[PDB]
Structure formats: C-alpha cells, structure tokens
Design a binder for this molecule. Structure first.
Ligand SMILES: *[C@@H]1O[C@H](CO)[C@@H](O[C@@H]2O[C@H](CO)[C@@H](O)[C@H](O)[C@H]2NC(C)=O)[C@H](O)[C@H]1NC(C)=O
Ligand SMILES: *[C@@H]1O[C@H](CO[C@@H]2O[C@@H](C)[C@@H](O)[C@@H](O)[C@@H]2O)[C@@H](O)[C@H](O)[C@H]1NC(C)=O
Ligand code: NAG
Ligand code: NAG
Lengths: 185, 596
C-alpha cells in the first residue's frame, strides 16, 4: 500500500562524513548479514513502529563490529556514537564487484586528531591546519602542523576482509509516532 | 605540552600513507615478471621513487631532531629503523668508486659467458655446459678445464673492482657515520636492550666445538667409508688410499656437497614409487590433492578457502612466449591479497613446494590484524627454512595410511631400505665449515693494523685440520675469492652463516617433545592431533610488540642456545658409521704431489 525499500537498492553511497537522514511514515516491510535486538526481522509484526531515523555509510569490511553503542574505536569516536538507550541494529552486505573499479577509488576521508570529547551526532566542518607547538603555525605544512583528511584507495583486487561493504543503520525512536500495521475491524 | 604525542602523529600518518605505494609497487613487480615487455623492463626505479622521497625526507625530519626523552623501548626501536638512514651525503667523486665496486658486479655478470675450449664465437652461457656431466656421463677434460677457463677468460673480468678493494678500501670507510658496515652485512644481530634481559649473539658462533663434538670426526671416518661403500663413483684416476681430490672438487664456487654422495648401488631392480607414473595407480587422483592436503590441516578446527583464491591461482603453465619463473613465489601483495602462480606438472618437488605455499598462505593471516609496521612473522628465516622439514614430513606414507588402502604396518621390506632412501644426515651441514673465516674476514680486517703475511692464509690450515684439501693451481690469498662472491650485488643475506642458518638451532629442542614422541619426528604425530592446533596456529603470530626471545622461549623453555635437537634421531646410521674407524690414515699421507 506504500513504497518502503528505497535505501536497500541504492545507487551510490555518500562519504563517511555527510550522514543522510529521512523522515517517512505509514510503511512496513519484511525479510549478507543481518542482526538486530528488538525483535526478529521476520516476526516483527507484533510491535508498534513509531519513528523512522534512517542512515547509511561505507565502512571497511572487517570493522563492522565497531558500530554499536558504548564501544571503542577511532571511527566511532570521530564519526558516530550511540547512547545507552540503544534501540535499533546494523545491516550490511558486500558489494565489492558493484562498488570497486579496477583503476582504484580514492575519494573518501576520516579523522585522526581531536581536542575534547564529542556528544553523539556532532559535526565539525573546519579543516584548519592543526597546531600543537607553542609557536603558532601560520600555515606551514609539517612540524606537527598538517592537514587531517586522508584517502582510502579501494580496488576490486583487494582482499575479502578489506573488500568494500555497504552499511545500513535504522533507528526507530519509541516515541508516540503513528504505526504501520492494521486490518479489518 | 609533551613531545610524545608531538612526534607520534609524524609516525602514524606515514604508517597509514605507505600502503598505497607498497600496493602499487607490488602490482608493478607482478606485472613485470609475468608480462615482460619493454614497457615493463623498468619498474622499480620509477615505482619506488615516491617511496624513496618519502623515506629520505622523513629520515631527515626524524634524524636532526632526536627523541631523547621517550619512555617505551619498543616504540623507540620501532621508529629507530626509519629514523636512521643515509648513503647520500658523501662527495660523488669519492663515493662513486665505492658504489662502483658494490654494483658493477651485476653488469659484468650479465655480460659474462663461459664456453667450450673449441668454441671461438658461437657458444652458450655457463650453466648448461658443465652442470649435467656428473649425473649423465663420464668426461674428464670438460670438468678439468673449468677452473682454468674461469681464471683465464671468465674470472679475469672481476679484477677492475678487485685491485682497488684489497689494496685501499679497508680504511676509507671512515666517513660512514657509524662504527662500520661489516656489522650490518654479517652482524646486524648484535643489539643490546632492557626490560628484564640483555641479549647477545656471539654464543651462536663460538660454540662450534661444543655443538659438534659429535660431528667433528666425520671426515676422518668418511675417508675410509668411501672405500667401504662408495667405490662405484669413479675409478682409474682418483687416489684409492691417498688424499681426497681437490682438482675435481665438483663445482666452481663451492656451494653444496650433494654432488658426490649418491654413488653406492648394490642392486638394480626394484618396484619403487615415482611421481611420474605411480601417481594414480593405487587409488589416487591428481585433481583433489589440493583439497586433501588442505583437509589434513583444515579439519583440525579451521574453515576452508573461498573460490577467489581458486580463480586467482590458475593451474596452467605459461609455456608460450609469455613466460614466468615456474618456481612459485608466495606473493606478499598485502591488503589481504595472497596469490600463487605455478605450472601444470606433477612432481614431488611440486608437492613439497605447494605444501610450503599453502602453509605460508594459511599462517599469514594470524597477524593480519596488525597495521603496516608488523607485516611479517617472528622471523623470515623460518618462513623459508621450514619448507625442508615440511617436505620431509610430506615424504612419508602417512598419506597412504590416512586414505586407508595400504595399512601403516606395511613397512618397507628389509632389502628395500638400504638402496636409495637412507641418506639425509650431512646434506645440510656439508657446507658449514668453510664459512667461518669468510664471516670474520671483515671482522678482523676492519682494524687496519693487520700485516700482509696473513691475508686469508687460514684456509689451507683449516683444510689440513678438518677436511684434507690439497690445493691445485692456486686461487690463493692474493686471489680474494670471497671478495668475488657472486651474490654481492644482489643484497642477499650473509649475516649468520649463509641465510636462515643459526636461528634454526634451538627452536626444535622441544618440537616433537610437545608433539608427544619420546624420540624423533618419526612416529611423531602431526595429523588429526588436537594438540598440534593449539601448539602452532595460535602462537605463530608475534609482531613487533614483543621481542623475539619471548616467542622463542614460549616454544623452547630456555633463553640460551643448545644443540639437543641434534639427538639420536640420526643414530640408525651413526651406529654404522662412528664406532670402528679411529685408526686409519685420513687426508694427507705424503705420497702424492701437494702443490698440484
Ligand atoms: C571445511 O571443510 C569442508 C568444506 O565444506 C566442511 O565439511 C563439509 O561441509 C559440507 C557442507 O557443510 C558437508 O556437506 C560435508 O559433509 C562436510 N564434510 C565433512 C564434515 O567431512 C567443513 O565443515 C569446513 N569447515 C568449516 C569450519 O566450515
Ligand atoms: C643491559 O646491559 C647493561 C649494562 O650496563 C648498562 O650500560 C648502560 C646502558 C648504562 O645504562 C649503564 O648505567 C648500565 O649499567 C646492564 O646494566 C643491564 O642490566 C642489561 N639489561 C638488562 C635488562 O639486564
Ligand atoms: C532490489 O531489492 C530487492 C528486495 O528484496 C532484492 O531482492 C533485489 O536483489 C534488489 N536488486 C534488484 C536489482 O532487484
Ligand atoms: C600482457 O600484455 C598484453 C598486452 O598489453 C595483454 O594482451 C596480455 O593479456 C598481458 N598478459 C596477461 C597475463 O594479462
């Protein structure tokens, strides 16, 4: 009665920085790896679905284990963290032959340094040269003063453990938002 | 406001950066030795140019400002390697002679040729003319003229790098900003540190007598065991009771001693086994050998390989104008890319090499979780030295016992064990003795106080002492044969004895002890054993986080080196060899010509 699965068959996945968040309503659906907490994805019909908070990213193959609330890791520290009120799951699948080009794809970034703690779902767009010496760097490369971002370099020849994956994360806030299941009388 | 985190990022960014350069150089190298075209003949100098720029600039960055106040020796050593470098500071006019004597060897070797005495122009390279005589025919003059042709028209063009070296080069390394370079060419193991133990290296060399009192009087018995059993080798010219010959030593540069042993034949007829024809006769097939030699070490609690490796490793020989070195190499492409190339041909060499290759490609992922600066096992010497002992384990009928048609009690009959398959004792150690003065040559010419009465005179006294070589036409001390070693420009190791030599000593003090046999590897179980998996697959991963002595100890139980693996495993023929002959005349007997 409504189209639901736009994000599963997506065309391209954005960078690991710009998150994509959509609001929808009154839709439901059913079913390489899948694992969630609230309820079985096939029997989930027995509960009230209220809020939709969708996102997706690209993560190297092996470190899919780091996407969970209250974990440790550089990628989690600099991109995304989750709170103690965890309600959701992480879905991913391998698309090496679909996302890797023989020449090599080198258009992705990450972060290495910070200055303080970060609240979940926070962004800093500034890319100014990083100073730690007493004498302030006025834009001199090196000497602890550099540029933060760095590429990734994926190829189809890369190994299975480090082959690219497409990452899907769905968050449903258990607020009083409307449901997506009903019937006759 | 601390220097630790100030200097750490400098290490981390380049540790993240170097992966792309390493990967690109790997594909370039593979493309070249697989596809040899004029477009590909030059890959290294252009692919590693960026790597060399990175290395040099970061070396000048880290060198000029040191890291005095750091409190973690593991990290200090880890950044020390790329902290210190050089070889690009000295003046060209004087450093050019040094790099010339180092490098110009390869050019003359590439333009060299050795040929027949009656082949003026049309003739072929060195190897095929002389390497087949001992195994095929009996022709004397062709082998006899070898050293004369060498010394007259093949070894004479190693002099332009010769005459200056032995005359002047001993002292002119004073501007090398180090103690010396022989310490790094044959001594890059002398390192002293902290955290519980201070470790040394000279105990791995000074124990010659200690560790081979049991093998030292072996020439003194073989000198008569030749007449005892090896008579069928060569009569009518070789002295029966005199000295061992030295004008027919066997080869040109004295590498191995395996070209003179297999000449005792008491019988000719036998239903032997062979990879050429007997491969598939007795309930065997050639296609599933790769699957079953996997099963034997994967059914122990490991999962199997995907089809990616299967389609990446094609099973056809090059054959055509496109050709690769049919010798298979465990390609360390990195980034979880492990690949091997081979030729379609069944041989026992092929089986042993394939076994070593799958051992490599299986143990490699144990440390796969570590970042770039730890991409190797405990020691690369083992990764290429254990091929021999795995081949030895493979060459035994445990396979026939495991497939279950010929029962294991079908031991070889008595008259079948004496012919061909009981000579393996000194094949490894027959090349050891003549390397000590070569190893110490720089170690005692670095001083510069040495006089000219001793250049390398010790050779002849060592032969008189242990071996009994009576020197023909002299390649004497004036003719510095060690200075003319062939692999000088190929930067292969000569650091311990030749390569992966002395690190093999103390590790096997308890290998089969853990593999639970009272004695040797014979009847020691490796297959279907639960203890083998937890004895190897979890501990075969060290990294740079812990010193190599901890990895050694966790296997052996002792820090010092011993020789207990040299146990009664070799007894069944030592009981034939070393009891009787302690009376006969060995070596020099004053009945022949010494100078000739
Ligand atoms: C590695 O070896 C084989 C590869 O499939 C597995 O054993 C076989 O598995 C298939 C599929 O499950 C069965 O149909 C066969 O009967 C199995 N053969 C046996 C048990 O002899 C084995 O399980 C694999 N190891 C792992 C950990 O997956
Ligand atoms: C390593 O060898 C040390 C030798 O003496 C030390 O030499 C230098 C490094 C100075 O620090 C000097 O004061 C020292 O006495 C031993 O002292 C040391 O114990 C050895 N290492 C270990 C772990 O025992
Ligand atoms: C599109 O989504 C469906 C939903 O299950 C999936 O089966 C299919 O493989 C996807 N791709 C294509 C090309 O249909
Ligand atoms: C070698 O190069 C030629 C032409 O560049 C190409 O056709 C061939 O496939 C290459 N060899 C391999 C093994 O790919």
């Amino acid at each position: 009665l409504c189209p639901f699965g736009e994000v599963f068959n997506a065309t391209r996945f954005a960078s690991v920085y710009a998150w994509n968040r959509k609001r929808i309503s009154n839709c439901v659906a059913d079913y390489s790896t899948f694992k969630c907490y609230g309820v079985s994805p096939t029997k989930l019909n027995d509960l009230c679905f209220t809020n939709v908070y969708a996102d997706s990213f690209v993560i190297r193959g092996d470190e899919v284990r780091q996407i969970a609330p209250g974990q440790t890791g550089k990628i989690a520290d600099y991109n995304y963290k989750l709170p103690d009120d965890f309600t959701g799951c992480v879905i991913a699948w391998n698309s090496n032959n679909l996302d890797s080009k023989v020449g090599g794809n080198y258009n992705y970034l990450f972060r290495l340094f910070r200055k303080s703690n970060l609240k979940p779902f926070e962004r800093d767009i500034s890319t100014e040269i990083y100073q730690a010496g007493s004498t302030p760097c006025n834009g001199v490369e090196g000497f602890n003063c550099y540029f933060p971002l760095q590429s990734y370099g994926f190829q189809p020849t890369n190994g299975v453990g480090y082959q690219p994956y497409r990452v899907v994360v769905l968050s449903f806030e258990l607020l009083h938002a409307p449901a997506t299941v009903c019937g006759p009388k | 406001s601390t220097t630790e985190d100030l200097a750490k990022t400098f290490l981390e960014k380049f540790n993240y950066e170097a992966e792309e350069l390493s990967y690109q150089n790997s594909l370039a190298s593979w493309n070249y030795n697989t596809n040899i075209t004029d477009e590909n003949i030059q890959k290294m100098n252009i692919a590693g140019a960026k790597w060399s720029a990175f290395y040099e600039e970061e070396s000048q960055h880290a060198k000029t400002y040191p890291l005095e106040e750091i409190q973690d020796p593991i990290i200090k050593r880890q950044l020390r390697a790329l902290q210190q470098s050089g070889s690009s500071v000295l003046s060209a006019d004087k450093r050019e002679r040094l790099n010339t004597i180092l490098n110009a060897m390869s050019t003359i070797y590439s333009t060299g040729k050795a040929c027949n005495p009656n082949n003026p122009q049309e003739c072929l390279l060195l190897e095929p003319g002389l390497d087949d005589i001992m195994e095929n025919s009996k022709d004397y003059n062709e082998r006899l003229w070898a050293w004369e042709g060498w010394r007259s028209e093949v070894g004479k063009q190693l002099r332009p790098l010769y005459e200056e070296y032995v005359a002047l080069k001993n002292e002119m390394a004073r501007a090398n900003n180090y103690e010396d370079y022989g310490d790094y060419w044959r001594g890059d193991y002398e390192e002293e540190w902290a955290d519980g133990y201070n470790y040394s290296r000279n105990q791995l060399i000074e124990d010659v007598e200690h560790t081979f009192t049991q093998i030292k009087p072996l020439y003194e018995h073989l000198h008569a065991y030749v007449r005892a059993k090896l008579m069928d080798a060569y009569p009518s010219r070789i002295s029966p009771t005199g000295c061992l010959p030295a004008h027919l030593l066997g080869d040109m540069w004295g590498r191995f001693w395996t070209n003179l042993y297999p000449l005792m034949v008491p019988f000719g007829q036998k239903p032997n086994i062979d990879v050429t024809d007997a491969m598939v006769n007795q309930s065997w097939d050639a296609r599933r050998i790769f699957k079953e030699a996997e099963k034997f070490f994967v059914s122990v609690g490991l999962p199997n390989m995907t089809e990616g490796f299967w389609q990446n490793s094609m099973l056809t020989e090059p054959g055509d104008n496109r050709k690769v070195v049919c010798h298979p190499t465990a390609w360390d492409l990195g980034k979880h890319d492990f690949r091997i190339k081979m030729c379609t041909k069944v041989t026992m060499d092929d089986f042993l090499t394939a076994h070593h290759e799958m051992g490599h490609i299986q143990y490699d992922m144990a440390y796969a979780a570590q970042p770039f600066l730890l991409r190797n096992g405990a020691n690369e010497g083992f990764h290429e030295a254990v091929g021999e002992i795995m081949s030895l384990s493979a060459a035994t009928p445990n396979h026939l016992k495991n497939i279950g048609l010929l029962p294991p009690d079908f031991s070889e009959d008595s008259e079948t064990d004496i012919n061909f398959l009981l000579k393996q004792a000194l094949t490894i150690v027959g090349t050891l003795p003549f390397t000590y003065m070569l190893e110490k040559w720089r170690w005692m010419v670095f001083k510069g106080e040495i006089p000219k009465e001793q250049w390398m005179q010790k050779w002849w006294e060592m032969k008189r002492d242990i071996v009994g070589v009576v020197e023909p036409l002299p390649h004497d001390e004036t003719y510095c044969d060690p200075a003319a070693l062939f692999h000088v420009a190929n930067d292969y190791s000569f650091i311990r004895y030749y390569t992966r030599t002395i690190y093999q000593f103390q590790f096997q003090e308890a290998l089969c002890q853990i593999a639970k046999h009272e004695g040797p590897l014979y009847k020691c179980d490796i297959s279907n054993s639960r203890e083998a998996g937890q004895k190897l697959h979890e501990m075969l991963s060290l990294g740079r986080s812990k010193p190599w002595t901890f990895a050694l100890e966790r296997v052996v139980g002792a820090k010092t080196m011993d020789v207990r693996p040299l146990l009664n495993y070799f007894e069944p023929l030592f009981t034939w060899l070393k009891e009787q002959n302690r009376n006969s005349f060995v070596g020099w007997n004053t009945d022949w010509s010494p100078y000739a």
